[PDB]
Design a protein around this nucleic acid. Structure first.
Ligand SMILES: Nc1ncnc2c1ncn2[C@@H]1O[C@H](COP(=O)(O)OP(=O)(O)OP(O)(O)=S)[C@@H](O)[C@H]1O
Ligand SMILES: Nc1ncnc2c1ncn2[C@@H]1O[C@H](COP(=O)(O)OP(=O)(O)OP(O)(O)=S)[C@@H](O)[C@H]1O
Ligand SMILES: [Mg+2]
Ligand SMILES: [Mg+2]
Lengths: 131, 333, 333
DNA sequence: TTTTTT
């Protein structure tokens, strides 16, 4: 199984993404053993905010591709791609602490991202491949 | 020798062009006062800061879009009320047929002076806007929900009939015919847009706006407004927390964001924006949940600070002048 | 000087617009009596209070959605019966093909004067709605189960064919073609929707409506109805406890919610609403499990108090009048 | 250009 590679996602900032991606877009396709849906795609990480301290896994350093499946539900404690305001994206782990949704990073140096009503989950991060 | 001949030829060509087309047909960009950018307040100080030049530009096309009940009509009516306070004449093209005159009055709009038109067709709406712009007596025109700008053929047609790009072509022709007229008459045309879903977008922005592609090119400012939370007085929801992102800007830097509260029956919370901007500009001290101005504890929480600044007009005006001097990148003359 | 010229130009352009498009094409919003919001009862007093304006606005689009057996059809038929009691003519577009005329007669609907259509396709249903709105002789239209508005191309094809955004496109076109007609004829169109599943919902329920996004933008009032319990006469379940949330309101403040009982065969328990509202407005004294009015003990338990109010019409009228005076923020007459 | 669907 091989899936498209679409741009990058900022790990801990909710950075804007200018450009829109269709299935016909992208000239990079990366294969893996993970059996995701046909809407799944690869996102490559720029940012060290989701790099876990050594000895604890999983970790997502800058440059590694993460497979995102929008057709799989994200539960608290899972890793997801979140969209803020329709244009901004982030890659963080999802926890619903005290009835308010938060995106917390694997790097303590970076702060927890509060989520508002304009926030939604793009998909679930289900695989990781170095390019 | 060579340069003097070039100057003579250029002067002759310029004189010929002025004789053919008029006095202001061609001239140097530096000595063209008609091309100066003039702005008006949007009713939100944070949005005035985010727009860079201090508000929406006169003589341009502005697009505001977002999801349902994101505050597009309220922001529009706050702009209209701010313009009407300055003696300007405004017009509301209510293509959605969903304007409440009483609520518009409650937002500060001079309803007795607001020209209101509920056009049958999209062509009628755009022709009314064109006539109002050509008049030179209307300063702000708002077209609510260009998604409701239905072409005459589609209205005369049946449900399910296909009219491929007919509204898009009509909006393209409207932009072509309206840009110059709006620039000449210094009229601000604000287009309100609804959001539709792009089918087949695996990553990125999944939304488009209605009406095609012409509005994206011709708009000098494009605002993406969204509801990011609720304002509650304990149990009742009394307002909404609103974010505005400047996705396009031809008069300043884009992608700046503005946060404010829209209170139901009052509109944009100007005083709360003043509180936040004073807090950011080191004018109001925030110790945890305690807001203090120059040592005097003004209240606890945003609501109490807003109420106190409402109760003390002198200090509110002082903080407002300080914030306008400091934060405004392009303070208007 | 220039102000007189501006006034002259404004008058001339306005006269030109009226000449081109009609006498009511453009005018000041203050003197526009066609923009006044008029409402009709929803059959539930708590809902009329929660709606702020006293009911569903005439000439607008209203969406009522919720889970199965939540009371959408019953509430819509109570709206129809209340409208028909005021001499209005109503139509019911039964797209789901599951309307029981005997139950409608039980709820109080005049079956003989109710126009009913069981359309084959969604295009036919929306064309019938457009024709009824353009006629001007129908005051209330109901489209049962927007989810059942099947496109003609979807009906003609076989099961398994993918019609991507066909229903959403059809509903967007219908909203475009119907908003103006409904506003012109002052016809209330109520769309009943089903609830469907949704991915990625950070806040609120993981639910969505059918038919696309246009109905979210075009509806003046959107109602979320849910069944929050059961009403039992001993061991028999005789009704349902229902909560209606105003998730969208264009004529008053949104997010207010109402609670009432839908009793099978009778509809909305108006007298139970009267009991609860008189209790909350200190009109009916609540002493633990005992209810009293003006010192006189009226009964114990909500059911027995409601039975008492049925037994005594005069005190019912008095409590209703006082509650309507105290709580309705927009009285018309 | 147009528009989600489970
Ligand atoms: N008459 C009113 N009274 C009180 N609150 C209102 C009224 N009209 C609108 N609101 C609220 O004000 C907020 C902003 O509303 P709008 O300005 O109409 O936004 P909108 O983008 O125009 O939404 P649309 O046009 O229905 S898609 C929302 O929370 C509305 O519920
Ligand atoms: N003919 C009937 N006689 C008695 N009770 C009924 C009858 N029809 C419906 N009910 C009950 O009335 C309540 C509301 O019914 P409806 O108005 O049909 O709900 P609904 O929102 O339309 O849900 P749907 O259309 O079935 S998905 C439910 O508790 C039903 O069991
Ligand atoms: Mg609006
Ligand atoms: Mg039903």
């Amino acid at each position: 199984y091989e899936y498209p590679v679409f741009s990058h996602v900022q790990a801990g900032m909710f950075s804007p993404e200018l450009r829109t991606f269709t299935k016909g877009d992208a000239e990079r396709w990366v294969s893996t053993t993970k059996k995701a849906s046909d809407s799944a795609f690869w996102l490559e990480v720029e940012g060290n905010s989701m790099t876990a301290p050594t000895g604890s896994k999983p970790s997502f350093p800058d440059g590694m591709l993460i497979l995102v499946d929008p057709e799989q539900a994200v539960e608290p404690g899972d890793f997801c791609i979140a969209r803020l305001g329709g244009d901004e994206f982030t890659f963080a782990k999802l926890i619903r602490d005290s009835g308010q949704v938060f995106l917390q990073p694997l790097n303590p140096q970076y702060p927890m991202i509060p989520c508002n009503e304009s926030c939604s989950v793009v998909g679930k991060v289900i695989a990781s491949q170095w390019p | 020798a060579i340069d003097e001949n070039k100057q003579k030829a250029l002067a002759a060509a310029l004189g010929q062009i002025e004789k053919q087309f008029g006095k202001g047909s061609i001239m140097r960009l530096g000595e063209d006062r008609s091309m100066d950018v003039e702005t008006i307040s949007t009713g939100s100080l944070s949005l005035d800061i985010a727009l860079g030049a201090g508000g929406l530009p006169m003589g341009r096309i502005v697009e505001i879009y977002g999801p349902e009940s994101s505050g597009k009509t309220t922001l529009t009516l706050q702009v209209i009320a701010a313009a009407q306070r300055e003696g300007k004449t405004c017009a509301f093209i209510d293509a959605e047929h969903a304007l409440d005159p009483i609520y518009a009055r409650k937002l500060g709009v001079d309803i007795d002076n607001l020209l209101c038109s509920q056009p049958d067709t999209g062509e009628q709406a755009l022709e009314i806007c064109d006539a109002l712009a050509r008049s030179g007596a209307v300063d702000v025109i708002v077209v609510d929900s260009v998604a409701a700008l239905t072409p005459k053929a589609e209205i005369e047609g049946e449900i399910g009939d296909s009219h491929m790009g007919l509204a898009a072509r009509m909006m393209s022709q409207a932009m072509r015919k309206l840009a110059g007229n709006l620039k000449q008459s210094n009229t601000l045309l604000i287009f309100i847009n609804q959001i539709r879903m792009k089918i087949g977008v695996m990553f990125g922005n999944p939304e488009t706006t209605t009406g095609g592609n012409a509005l994206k090119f011709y708009a000098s400012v494009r605002l993406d407004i969204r509801r990011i939370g609720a304002v509650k007085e304990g149990e009742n929801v009394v307002g909404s927390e609103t974010r505005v992102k400047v996705v396009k800007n031809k008069i300043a830097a884009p992608f700046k964001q503005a946060e404010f509260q829209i209170l139901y029956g009052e509109g944009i919370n100007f005083y709360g924006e003043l509180v936040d901007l004073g807090v950011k500009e080191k004018l109001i001290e925030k110790a945890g949940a305690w807001y203090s101005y120059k040592g005097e504890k003004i209240g606890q929480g945003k609501a109490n600070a807003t109420a106190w600044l409402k109760d003390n007009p002198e200090t509110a005006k002082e903080i407002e002048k300080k914030v306008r001097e400091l934060l405004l990148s392009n303070p208007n003359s």
